[PDB]
């Protein structure tokens, strides 16, 4: 069986994230002197401070029980802090994580997640957290994040149709449209939590000198439409973290839109 966690609403959350025991910051690094602003800034903006958020989740969980009220509390809590500075990401493209976090409005002890849950995940750090948000409160709805933002690296090498032309030995131009798949917890380990491996589709230029050097130029779009957001296609420490969570607490899955395009520019040799 699983435990049930209230959604955050300003009648439950506790006044603090953490009942204000613990916070989230940048880790301490013995010998170096006091915590400055631009450290936690830093930290902020890095996949980190996700995993941190996560790891005391579950030290919290492991020190004082899954079913302990204040557990309980904890998790909503914590949780809607994420949604609030998520909100504040996607509202607000182009600002810092650090500043999301603590300096939206409402504050982050009000959020209520009812009234304001959004369809739309920024895909910044934040991201990953918010999804198990979702999970925990959502009820199935659908959800999105675009493409432009999660951070795609794409390697041309790696995908067999541009590869199979960069290894004939073939010279100049050469179009490209082909599908592959892409597992996205290979590098970022914020996008592979949630969304893991996914499957796009190129189309473009495949550009070859007879010294073995290559230009691709594309469009990358998703090929599925949509993408499960479940304990099985996590992928990643993050995603792990995830899967521990959600084997815990009451949830319902659901799926993940993926709309948008990026273009592309990778350089290589053969």
């Known amino acids: 069986e699983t435990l049930t966690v209230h959604a955050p609403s300003p009648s439950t959350n506790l006044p603090s994230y953490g009942n204000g025991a613990f916070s989230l910051s940048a880790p301490h690094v013995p010998g170096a002197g006091p915590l400055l602003v631009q450290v936690v800034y830093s930290f902020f903006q890095s996949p980190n401070m996700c995993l941190q958020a996560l790891t005391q989740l579950e030290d919290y969980i492991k020190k004082h029980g899954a079913s302990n009220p204040l557990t309980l509390q904890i998790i909503s ?5 994420f949604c ?3 909100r504040n990401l996607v509202l607000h493209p182009g600002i810092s994580v650090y500043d999301a976090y603590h300096f939206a409005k409402p504050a982050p002890s009000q959020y209520d ?13 934040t991201t990953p957290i918010v999804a198990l948000a979702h999970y925990l409160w959502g009820n ?4 999105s994040v675009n493409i432009a933002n999660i951070g795609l690296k794409i390697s041309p090498m790696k995908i067999n149709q541009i590869k199979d032309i960069i290894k004939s030995g073939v010279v100049g131009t050469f179009a490209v449209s082909t599908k592959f798949t892409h597992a996205t917890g290979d590098y970022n380990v ?14 473009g230029t ?17 090929y599925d439409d949509k993408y499960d957001f479940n304990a099985s296609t996590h ?14 607490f009451s949830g319902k899955e659901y799926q993940i839109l993926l709309p948008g395009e990026i273009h592309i520019k990778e350089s290589g040799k053969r």
Do not use: C, F, H, P
């Open 77 to 81: 809590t914590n949780i809607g802090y």
């Open 84 to 86: 609030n500075a998520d």
């Open 113 to 125: 997640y009812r009234s304001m849950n959004m369809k739309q995940m920024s895909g910044n750090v």
């Open 140 to 143: 199935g709805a659908e959800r």
């Open 190 to 203: 914020i996008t592979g939590a949630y969304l893991g491996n996914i499957t796009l589709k190129t189309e």
């Open 206 to 222: 495949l550009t070859i000198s007879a010294n073995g050097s290559w230009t691709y130029n594309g469009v990358v779009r998703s």
């Open 235 to 248: 992928r990643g420490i993050i995603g792990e973290s995830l899967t521990r969570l959600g084997a815990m």
